[PDB]
Structure 1
Amino acid sequence: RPEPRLITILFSDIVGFTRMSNALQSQGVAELLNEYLGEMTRAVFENQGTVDKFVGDAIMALYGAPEEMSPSEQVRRAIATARQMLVALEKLNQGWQERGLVGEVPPVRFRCGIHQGMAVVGLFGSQERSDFTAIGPSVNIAARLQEATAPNSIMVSAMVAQYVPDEEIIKREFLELKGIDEPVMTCVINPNM
C-alpha cells in the first residue's frame, strides 16, 4: 500500500528538444536521446539514486525511496547527481559537435529542479498496470522549480538549500509557481562544489 515518507525529488529536462526534434529526424533523435539518457541514468545510479521514470526528454529521480535514506544524504546525493549530469552534458555536446548532430541546431542544455518534502510513495495504477512513483504537492514543486529555472542551472528549494553553504547559493529569491498558492523560496545553486 502507498504510504507517506520524506523524500527528495529531482527533475532534469532538456531545453527546446522539440526544435532539434526536426532536421535531426528519427535515427538522430533516437540516437541522441538514448545516449543523453544513458549518461543521466548513470549519474543517478552512481549517486545512489532511483530513476522513477522518463517523461519525454525529462528524467525523474528519487532519493529516500524505495530505499530508506537520511535527509542529509537525500539532498547531498541529489545535488551531486545534478552537478554530475552537467559534467556529462558538456562532454556529450563535445561528442555530438564533432559529429554534426549539433550545429541550425545549438548544443543541448537542461533545466534541473530539486526539492525535499513528504509524498505518498508506492505502487500506483491498476492490477493490470501499475508503476512505482511518488505522488503529492512535493513532486509538483520539484517539477515547477525545474520549469521556472534558467537553461543549464540547478534550482532547489529552501528545504534543500539548508544543506548547502550559502557560498554555493548563487541566487536566492521568492517565485510564484504554477499550482502553488504560497510563493516558494527558490535557490539557484552553484554547479561546482
Structure 2
Amino acid sequence: LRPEPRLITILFSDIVGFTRMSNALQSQGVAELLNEYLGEMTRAVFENQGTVDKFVGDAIMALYGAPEEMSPSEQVRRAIATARQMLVALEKLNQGWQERGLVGRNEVPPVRFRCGIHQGMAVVGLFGSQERSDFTAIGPSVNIAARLQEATAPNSIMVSAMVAQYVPDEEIIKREFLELKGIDEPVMTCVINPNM
C-alpha cells in the first residue's frame, strides 16, 4: 500500500459560509449540525463506492480509484453521482433543520456547499510516520480539485476538462478557463448540471 503514481479522481465538497454559521449557533448546535451533515454526505460517498480520504473542517475529501482500482470512466461516473446525491440529501437535511429552527431562522441560512472534482495523476498511498500515517493522495491534481471547489458557486459542481471528457454535452452548463492558485497554466473548468 506504499505511495505510487496513479490515475484517480478527487472530489472536494465544502460548506458555504461555515464561519458565520459557526458563530451564530451554540457550539452544541454547530457540532450536531456538522455531524448530521457529515453523516449524510459520507453516506453518499460510500454508496457510490468512493473512499472518504478525510474531513478538513467543513470539507470532505473523497477519492475514486484508490485504494481499490477503478476505470477512468467509472471514477468519473461515481464521483459525479456522489456530488449529485449530496445535493439531494442536503435539500432533505435543511427541511429537518428548518423545522428544528437550526437554519433559516435568526441569521443562519440553509446549508449550501461547493463541490470540485478533478481526475489526474497523483501519488497515492500511506503518508506519515510509523507512529501515525494515513492513506491520501498528493500532487497538483489534488490542489486542482480543491481550487475548483473554492472557485465554483454555492450548490454547484465544477469539474476539470479531464472529468468533462466523460460527461454528456447536454450536462455541461458552462466551459471556462480559470487561473487556479498554485497552477501555472490556466485550467479549463466545466460546471455540470446538478440534477440527477
Structure-2 separation of matches of 1:192 and 1:30: 29
Residue 61 of structure 1 is matched in structure 2 by: 62
> Among 95, 105, 115, which residue is 2:118 paired with?
115
Distance 1:21 1:13 in 2: 14
Matches of 1:19 and 1:93, distance apart in 2: 17
- CA deviation map 1:132-177 (0-9, x unaligned): 1000110000001000101110000000001101110001110111
Cα deviations across residues 113-133 of structure 1 (Å, max 9, x unaligned)?
A: 000000000000011111110
Q: Whole-Å Cα distance in 2 between the matches of residues 170 and 153 of structure 1?
A: 10
Q: Please report how far the alpha carbon of residue 23 of structure 1 lies from its aligned counterpart in structure 2 after TM superposition.
A: 2.5
- SS of the residue corresponding to residue 21 of structure 1 reads helix
1:130 equivalenced with 2:145 (yes/no): no
Q: How far off its partner does 1:183 sit?
A: 0.2
Q: What SS does structure 2 have at the residue aligned with 1:131?
A: strand
Distance 1:105 1:91 in 2: 17
Instruction: Report the number of matched residues.
Output: 193
Distance (whole Å) between structure 2 residues aligned to residue 105 and residue 140 of structure 1: 30
CA distance in 2, matches of 1:23, 1:107: 13
Match of 2:78 in 1: 77
For residues 102 and 39 of structure 1, the distance between their equivalents in structure 2, rounded to whole angstroms, comes to: 17
**Alignment partner of 1:154 is 2:150:** no
- Helix, strand or coil for the counterpart of 1:112? strand
Partner of 1:179: 182
Gaps of 5+ in 1: none
- The alpha-carbon deviation at position 66 of structure 1 amounts to 0.2
Deviations 1:58-92 (A, max 9, x none): 00000000000000000000000000000011111
1:59 alignment partner, SS class: strand
Residue 5 of structure 1 deviates from its aligned partner by 0.6
Question: 1:20 and 1:116 mapped to 2: Cα distance?
Answer: 32
Please provide the CA RMSD for this pair. Answer: 0.6
Q: CA deviation at 1:36?
A: 0.2
Shift of 1:20: 1.0
SS in 1 for 2:101: coil
- Give the CA deviation at 1:25: 1.4
3-state SS of 1:22 partner:
helix
Paired with 1:97 and 1:181, the residues of 2 have a C-alpha distance of 43
Shift of 1:107: 0.4
1:22 deviation in Å?
1.3
Query: Following superposition, which runs of at least 4 residues in structure 1 exceed 6 angstroms of deviation?
Result: none
CA distance in 2, matches of 1:141, 1:131: 21
Counterpart CA distance in 2 for 1:66 and 1:105 is 38
**Residue 137 of structure 2: SS of its match in structure 1?**
strand
Secondary structure (helix, strand or coil) at the match of 2:12 reads strand
CA distance in 2 between partners of 1:83 and 1:74 (Å)? 14
- Residue 180 of structure 1 aligns to a residue whose secondary structure is coil
Deviation for aligned residue 1:15: 0.6
Identity over the aligned pairs, expressed in percent? Answer: 100
